[PDB]
Structures are given as C-alpha cells and as structure tokens.
Write a protein that binds this ligand. Structure first.
Ligand SMILES: [Zn+2]
Ligand SMILES: [Zn+2]
Lengths: 257, 92
C-alpha cells in the first residue's frame, strides 16, 4: 500500500466514523490531504458516504478542495442517506455550477475528478445523472430534493431525430447511446419521478407509456426493456386509480380539467 | 488414472465432479487466469462433452456447463461501452 501511517489512520477513522479522530486529523495538519485514496480503494469522502456518517461527511465536505464529491453524491443517492445527499448538495461545487443538472459524461470538460470512481470508470454508467439514479432507485425524497434544485430528467429526442447532437452521439458508440436512452426512459418511467415530476401525473404516465410502446415497436432490439417500462407506467396509472375511495376522485382521474 | 480407476471408482467420479465444480465456479473462473470468458466457454464445452460421455452424472455436468454459460452471459451483460462489447465479442 502506497499510503502512509497518518493517512491510513485518517482513512480508517473516517471509514469507521471516529468523528473526534477525523476532526483532529483534518484540523491544522500540514500533511494528510483530504482526497488521499488507496491505489484500488476508496476516498475518505466515499468511505464516510458508503457508511452513513453525516457528521464525518460534513467535516470532509467542509474542506474546499475535495475529490470525487459527485461520486459521493451518487453513492448517497444510490442509498437512502437523504441527509448525506442534502449535505453534498449544500457543497459550493453543486450550488454555483451546472454540475448537478447535467450528466457526468457531458457536463463540462470534466478534467476534475468530480464524478470519478476508483481508477478507470464511474460507479454507475457515465450517462446516469443524479436525478436519473434517484428515479432508478425510486428514492422519493431524493427525487423531490433534486427536482427542487431544478434537476429534471430531460426527455430523450425522437428515435428518428436528425439534429447535430443526436447524429454526433450516433456516429460513435451507438450501444452506449441506446443504453443512455434506456436509462433516461427508466428514470422518466419511475413511479416516484412520475408522481413528483409534474401536475396531472396520470396523464403524463399514460402518454409516456404510449411513447414507450411505440419505441418498443420501432427498436425491435430492446423490446423487453421498453415493454417493462410501459408496464411500469401502466402499473402507476392503475395504482393511482386504485387508491381512490370517493366518487369525485374517480371522476377526476377518469377525466381531467 | 488407471490406479485410481481400479478401486473405488465411485469416489473417482465424485472427485472429478468436485474438481470440475471448482473449475466452473464463477469466482475461480474470474480470478483464475486472464481472458476468463474464453476459459469459461471452453470449460463449458468440455463439461457438455463430458455430460454426453458419462450418461450417469448428466445433470451434474449440465449444471456446471450452465454455471459457465451464466458466467459468460453475466460478464457480457455488465458491459456499458461499445469497446467492452467488442473486446468481449472477440479477443486480442
Ligand atoms: Zn436530436
Ligand atoms: Zn491420467
């Protein structure tokens, strides 16, 4: 292991949640850079996020220069650590940048290791944004939090779109293009995202289900994925209808304004 | 092999089944050698041929070949980039 003794102590204190030890180590120490990581291990922030330590994670986020903050956010969103998600969102990096709204792959020049993972890739698919991941997990609280920040799952373009961006994405790595479209629609077709996304979510769910069915007809390659997503939308519609216990609710669901 | 076959042939077959169960482990397949998908495919083919030959433990060898097929499909499935797909679909 290339790590030294003091950074090993700091990493184990953060991973095991020794808040006094972590605070002592990170305060007024010339050495012990906060973003020290093992060769094939996890950052201190990633360790304090994977195991829920809101105080330790907050102390780590107190430092201005920290690496893999986006990866810590994705780890917290993948889990139910709502307080950790809020703390990471409160970091100045997300607040004063387009980092939160846009995906790790296409947000910016991405020179900084913001969403980066251990060595090579990202924890999840590079196309998965925080809001898409939250919808994937159906994390209602996290989905609502990201919506309040303006982070909305952007609807993918039509299958027969001919604009410059879609064509450029189609030219190289078409498999990743299809995977990204499937992930985006999986985020849109989340019951949590459907309910919390916009007013009249039953109509939105019906229209999205129809669009997914048409895409299943068109693609003829990922037909099971789109059928599953349309099934999710149908389940959401029937579930929203089912919970009605009054005739006025039934009439409102069976016909809008 | 002949000396092992002379006495306790049932234990001989049991030992061969256990050794192949060890080889056809997804953990051993992944950690055993470089290019584990090719190794898994070849091992699955060998297990299927042995299932044809034995005609006594056919279910065991079919199960092991199924384990190798599951490992191959699982390693393929986790690909999220076209370069990974191309590398899996054809080696060096
Ligand atoms: Zn387009
Ligand atoms: Zn021999």
């Amino acid at each position: 292991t290339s790590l030294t003794a003091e950074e090993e102590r700091f990493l184990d204190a953060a991973e095991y949640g020794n808040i006094p030890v972590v605070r002592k180590m990170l305060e007024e120490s010339k050495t012990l850079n906060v973003n020290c990581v093992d060769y094939m291990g996890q950052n201190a922030l990633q360790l304090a996020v994977g195991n829920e330590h809101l105080e330790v994670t907050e102390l780590l986020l107190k430092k201005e220069n920290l690496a893999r903050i986006g990866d810590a956010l994705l780890l917290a969103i993948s889990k139910g650590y709502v307080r950790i998600v809020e703390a990471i969102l409160n970091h100045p990096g997300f607040a004063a940048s387009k980092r939160l709204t846009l995906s790790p792959c296409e947000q910016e020049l991405q020179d900084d290791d913001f969403y980066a993972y251990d060595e090579d890739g990202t924890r999840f698919s590079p196309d998965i944004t925080p809001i898409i991941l939250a919808a994937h997990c159906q994390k209602y609280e996290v989905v609502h939090m990201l919506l309040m920040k303006g982070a909305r799952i952007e609807r993918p373009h039509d299958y027969f779109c001919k604009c410059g961006d879609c064509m450029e994405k189609q030219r190289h790595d078409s498999f990743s293009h299809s995977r990204s479209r499937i992930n985006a629609y999986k985020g849109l077709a989340s019951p949590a995202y459907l309910s919390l996304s916009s007013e009249d979510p039953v109509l939105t769910a019906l229209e999205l289900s129809n669009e997914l069915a048409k895409l299943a007809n068109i693609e003829k390659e990922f037909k099971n994925d789109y059928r599953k997503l349309s099934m999710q939308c149908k389940d959401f519609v029937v579930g929203v209808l089912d919970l009605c216990r009054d005739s006025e609710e039934v009439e409102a669901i069976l016909n809008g304004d």
